[PDB]
């Protein structure tokens, strides 16, 4: 099986920067192909036979390589080039793809705005309580959220979810959901959400009192 390893998995670039990702093949091939994919929709063919541009692809894109070692290059990074790029060989069976190189846009540090939502009265009637912390419009991606109920640290009773880089302002958003039983929620008072993030000099806390 011709395993295609792509370097790097994840990288960022400001507008106008030159970018170069690589594909490195376990067995020599003579022709490498590349697809571009945006946010779960169908891949588009982007480059075929190592360096020919497909229909629709701007001139800033090119490809190159031989044998074991190929690459896609963008002359000057643009906002609409945010995608995951997959290499592909059809020189022998099985036909194989790379793991993809995810390309995102650089921008400046941005601290999150932090909101916290008590559980609805609608949900409480049904017997569960979900407490939601929203971290909004931050950059870069990495962000620690931990929960406190009456100042006791919670552990593995919450999950995170994260937006793809926003296409207007190039930021992320994060939702954390602390799950409890109706009874357990109803025997404490102060629910708190402590977010830590590089754009903050000191971690920000948001809380509410149950009533």
């Amino acid at each position: 099986e011709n395993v295609l390893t792509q370097s790097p998995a994840i990288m960022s670039a400001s507008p106008g920067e030159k970018v170069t990702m690589t594909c490195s093949a376990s067995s020599s091939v003579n022709y490498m192909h590349w697809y571009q994919q945006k946010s779960s929709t169908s891949p588009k063919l982007w480059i075929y036979d190592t360096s020919k541009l497909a229909s629709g692809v701007p001139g800033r894109f090119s490809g190159s390589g031989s044998g074991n070692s190929y690459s896609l290059t963008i002359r000057t990074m643009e906002a609409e080039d945010v995608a995951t790029y997959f290499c592909f060989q059809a020189s022998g069976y099985p036909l194989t793809f790379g793991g993809g190189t995810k390309l995102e846009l650089k921008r400046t540090v941005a601290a999150p705005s932090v909101f916290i939502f008590p559980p609805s009265d609608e949900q409480l009637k049904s017997g569960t309580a979900s407490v939601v912390c929203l971290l909004n419009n931050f950059y870069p991606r990495e962000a620690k959220v931990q929960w406190k109920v009456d100042n006791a640290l919670q552990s593995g009773n919450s999950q995170e979810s994260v937006t793809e880089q926003d296409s207007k302002d190039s930021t992320y958003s994060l939702s954390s959901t602390l799950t409890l039983s109706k009874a357990d929620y109803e025997k404490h008072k102060v629910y708190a959400c402590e977010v830590t993030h590089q754009g903050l000099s000191s971690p920000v806390t948001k809380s509410f009192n149950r009533g």
Binding site: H33, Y35, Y48
Partner: protein, 212 residues
């Protein structure tokens, strides 16, 4: 105008078989190969097989045994049958036409296929009520299988909306939030409805979100 379009079940039980039809147009199956690719949720791409113009077939060796590809050139259709289903056959399936460089030049939309024995389950929808800027949202809890779509005021409100990717709960059910930031001044006058559609259970729910 080369076009492909897949249609399959969406949810099938393990050990049953997945049947997907690709319906093409703008080229002739007598002269042209159609390939099949799949993408497991949140992972990359895997090639499955091909049926060429002449009727012959090359399958991926991990699967040459559980997979068949066939066609009816007249009906404009390519068929994929995959047996002895496993949980990791869960994936979005595409069909493709090789063109330039024998690389995949044209792709269908894709159909999500979830491999599980469990029954469909529509979500509960709960509001995340507001407290310059105010945040409000919808929590969409305990549905199966994917996907749900969310919109605000029937597509009229897109500025400031973040709909999160779905997270898997301990129940084995999905959950997902959509939030939107608006000005706090607009809470009195304006009306925020969230529009949640779960096609697999046939659920539509419109939740007016009110101030706390």
């Amino acid at each position: 105008q080369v076009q492909l379009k897949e249609s399959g079940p969406g949810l099938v039980a393990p050990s049953q078989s997945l049947s997907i039809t690709c319906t093409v147009s703008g080229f002739s199956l007598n002269s042209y190969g159609v390939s099949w690719v799949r993408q497991p949720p949140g992972k990359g791409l895997e090639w499955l097989g091909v049926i060429w113009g002449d009727g012959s077939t090359n399958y991926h060796s991990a699967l040459m045994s559980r997979l068949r590809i066939s066609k009816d050139n007249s009906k404009r259709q390519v068929f994929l049958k995959l047996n002895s289903l496993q949980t990791d056959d869960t994936a979005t399936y595409y069909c493709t036409k090789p063109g330039s460089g024998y690389a995949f030049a044209y792709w269908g939309q894709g159909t999500l296929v979830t491999v599980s024995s469990a029954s469909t389950k529509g979500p509960s929808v709960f509001p995340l009520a507001p407290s310059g800027t105010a945040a409000l949202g919808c929590l969409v809890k305990d549905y199966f299988p994917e996907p749900v779509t969310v919109s605000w005021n029937s597509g009229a409100l897109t500025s400031g909306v973040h709909t999160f990717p779905a997270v898997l709960q301990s129940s084995g059910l999905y959950s997902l939030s959509s939030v939107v930031t608006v000005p706090s001044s607009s809470l009195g006058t304006q009306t925020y409805i969230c529009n949640v559609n779960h096609k697999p259970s046939n659920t539509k729910v419109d939740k007016k979100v009110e101030p706390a």
